[PDB]
From Swiss-Prot, chain A:
It holds the Pfam family Ribosomal_L27. Found on the solvent side of the large subunit. One of its GO terms (molecular function) is structural constituent of ribosome. Residues 1-21 are annotated as: Disordered. The gene is rpmA. One of its GO terms (cellular component) is cytosolic large ribosomal subunit. GO terms for biological process: translation. This is Large ribosomal subunit protein bL27. It comes from the Bacteria. Belongs to the bacterial ribosomal protein bL27 family. It comes from Thermus thermophilus (strain ATCC 27634 / DSM 579 / HB8). The keyword Ribonucleoprotein applies. Part of the 50S ribosomal subunit.
UniProtKB/Swiss-Prot annotation, chain B:
This is Large ribosomal subunit protein uL15. The chain holds residues 54 to 150 of 150 of the full protein. Binds to the 23S rRNA. The keyword Ribosomal protein applies. It comes from the Bacteria. GO terms for molecular function: rRNA binding; structural constituent of ribosome. Signal peptide: none annotated.
From Swiss-Prot, chain C:
Pfam families: Ribosomal_L35p (PF01632). InterPro entries: Ribosomal_bL35, Ribosomal_bL35-like, Ribosomal_bL35_CS, Ribosomal_bL35_sf. This is Large ribosomal subunit protein bL35. GO terms for molecular function: structural constituent of ribosome. Belongs to the bacterial ribosomal protein bL35 family. HAMAP family: Ribosomal_bL35 (MF_00514).
UniProtKB/Swiss-Prot annotation, chain D:
The keyword Ribosomal protein applies. Part of the 50S ribosomal subunit. GO terms for molecular function: rRNA binding; structural constituent of ribosome; tRNA binding. Belongs to the bacterial ribosomal protein bL33 family. One of its GO terms (cellular component) is ribosome. GO terms for biological process: translation. Found on the solvent side of the large subunit. The keyword Ribosomal protein applies. This is Large ribosomal subunit protein bL33. Signal peptide: none annotated. The chain holds residues 9 to 52 of 54 of the full protein. Keywords: Ribonucleoprotein, Ribosomal protein, RNA-binding, rRNA-binding, tRNA-binding. It comes from Thermus thermophilus (strain ATCC 27634 / DSM 579 / HB8).
Amino acid sequence: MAHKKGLGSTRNGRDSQAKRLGVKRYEGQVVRAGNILVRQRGTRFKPGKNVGMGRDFTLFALVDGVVEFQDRGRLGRYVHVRPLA
Amino acid sequence: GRSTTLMRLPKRGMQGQVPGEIKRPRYQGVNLKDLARFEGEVTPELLVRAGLLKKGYRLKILGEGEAKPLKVVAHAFSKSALEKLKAAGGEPVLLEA
Amino acid sequence: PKMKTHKGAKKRVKITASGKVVAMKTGKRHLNWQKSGKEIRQKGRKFVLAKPEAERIKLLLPY
Amino acid sequence: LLLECTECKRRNYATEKNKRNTPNKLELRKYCPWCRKHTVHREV
RNA sequence: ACCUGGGGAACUGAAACAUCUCAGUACCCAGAGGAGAGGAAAGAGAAAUCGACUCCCUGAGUAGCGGCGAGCGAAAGGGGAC
RNA sequence: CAUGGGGGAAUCUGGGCGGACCACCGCCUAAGGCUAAGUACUCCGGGUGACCGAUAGCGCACCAGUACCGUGAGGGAAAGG
RNA sequence: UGCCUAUUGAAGCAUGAGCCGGCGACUCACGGUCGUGGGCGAGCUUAAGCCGUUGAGGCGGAGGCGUAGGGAAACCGAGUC
RNA sequence: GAGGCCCGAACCGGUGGGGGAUGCAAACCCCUCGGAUGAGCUGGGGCUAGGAGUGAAAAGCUAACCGAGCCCGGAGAUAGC
RNA sequence: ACCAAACCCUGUCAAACUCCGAAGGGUCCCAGGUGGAGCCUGGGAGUGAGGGCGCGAGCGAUAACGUCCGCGUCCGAGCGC
RNA sequence: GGUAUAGGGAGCGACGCUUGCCCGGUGCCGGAAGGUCAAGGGGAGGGGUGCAAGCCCCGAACCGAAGCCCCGGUGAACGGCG
RNA sequence: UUGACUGGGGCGGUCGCCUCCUAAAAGGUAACGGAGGCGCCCAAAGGUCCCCUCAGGCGGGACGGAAAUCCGCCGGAGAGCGCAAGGGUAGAAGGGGGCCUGACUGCGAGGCCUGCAAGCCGAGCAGGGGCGAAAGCCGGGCCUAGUGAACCGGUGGUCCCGU
């Protein structure tokens, strides 16, 4: 045989399933009301013009329009929808 | 060897007691848009033997189209079906025997 | 010989007209899951995509 | 505890959840019934 | 061979298995005969109803039965033979 | 509807049934028996076949349930011109 | 660097085959679903059986699909829940 | 003149070795061994059977492969190989 | 005597550190692009045993024709030239 | 066609010298008390119906075996012996 | 009848969910690879209106450690945010107070994710409410874990069925 005697202190097999987050609708994309725009951990992207978020910080459009992003540094990064004609 | 989809719950309630089905009066439906197809005196039997029914039991008219005047016997009509031919037609109905 | 209809399937699914298979919502069946969450509300009927093609074939006669 | 609120002198339930030992007992509070609009709904 | 009665399996299926299934089948036994069985209502079941029994076609894979699983599955009524 | 065990009636002011149980409404007469036909089968006789044609068709077209095998139950050929 | 098979990978020192000749494996029944060739079309169609035929076909509407769907059901109805 | 006494034929058996290994033989031959008045050997006639028999007991024997005989049947068992 | 807290320099290190941050990748818009391209519905599948090489990482020992993933490719099916 | 000097089961295995301690757990034996306990007895009380008498249904106390719990013995009983 | 995974099997360890990393700057991504949690908890730890802003460091102060409580400067977040980690956050999601009970009923456009079936977000309309003068906010909790198809029954309720 020439056998051994291995074992496992394995106390690490583990992990949660991916939750797929991020900017789901980048800037410039025409969107209908309700389209969640961003899935975020915290408030990585603050809600802007015509954009609301719920319990899990999920930001979504409030009207029909184009998506526009914006940096405000000390203020933060915002995402909003500008309607049209 | 998983679960099929015998996973979905049987909502279909009120289903099968034991002696069996319950002998209850069935009502075959027929629109008058398929009725005006002819004229005169339209009543059960006169149907079945043609068009719809066939011992289908109770004859309840109703429907779209626009039936013309001609006393039409039946077992039931719609709050619509009535008014619809109320313009000119018949109110034959029920039974007492 | 004369395929027999699959009772169980019949007991839990109503097939509409245009050929859609529709059944209830798993999850709420008298909770057993328990203490609400306004979720209980969202339980009407539903369309079983792709799995009805199979569902259906089990009711060949009963239609 | 799996609690529910029985509108006094009728039916309906709210299906709440108290904490017993943790100051409880005598749970009841203005909820909306299906049999017309509000009452208070007790425990049980 | 077919038939009636008395007894009466398992393999298999359920992608394990015990209820269930196969199946009252295989087989064993008694008995009947050119057939055997059944047969003149303490019936059926909703029809002001029908009118011995048996056989076929429907009814119907319906009604139902079922670890409501796998799977099993009528009867009335309607056509016929007699 | 049958029936092994226990209890155990009544004779038409009787008794059973219509899916627990009552009450209505209605059906039928239990605890004795016989009864043709239409139905089933194919040892047997005949007639047909988008049936086989001797490694097929029956296991046997021939002296086959034979020879041979097996204690036995039983298994079981070949071979036509 | 044979043939077949099985393989990530075979001439392969992996499987099978001595050679030849015969026998030798996706069928039929009933349901069902698409496609297709036809008949008929708001209609279509017969079962069992009776009548003829003796390799004549008729007859037979019980029944079955389809003409309305929603709803657990009552029920309603181009609506319905 | 006693004896599950001794040596040793017949008779019963099968210790060790060689040979045999498509055998003379589906357990044999040669040499060598154990028992040999006993719980002995042997003829003839009878009885016990398949989850059963028989067994000084090895799961041994039950018609030349027994941790469940053989034959026929369920039967074309089932085979994710 | 830095044995030695913080603290300031001089030097540095880090998959689970980041003040910073490429190439690149993803998507939307406008264009190009007639391709065994696409998209919608439906009938039939097989496959669900991969393997090598290159590049990027785990495990290993900066071992393995080792082992797991990721992008690509070829073999598989091009053991044809 | 026998009758405890006999039969059955078990273990050890001529003969000699011997065969210690442990009944907590298991088994077996013994315990006319208690505990628990199934049919069945019993009917407090309630329900379905009818106009009713009634016909039907559930059903508490309590009375109820073996078994088990409980009390105790037991090692050539299973076993154990820092 | 006596499970599977498994650098043969047994033994050992493990089996669902959450969070970092591996993961190669969209997602997603393996290994018996590295490293930790969950199977609950809040009747206030929930609504809304109105207020307040931390941790530290440095002095100064009766009892008083090296932070008990005070006063004074400095200190943009290193505290806090019920429990793991992460993201987020004081221009509050943190600390306190007053009234409250939307931890509602009917619904649900439009999406996220995705084989299925599940999971997640959600504006808006109706009804009848809360807090605020108001604009307004309110279908539980800073957010991601705290969970289990069907079948079979149990308690209620009710427009239904009831041979």
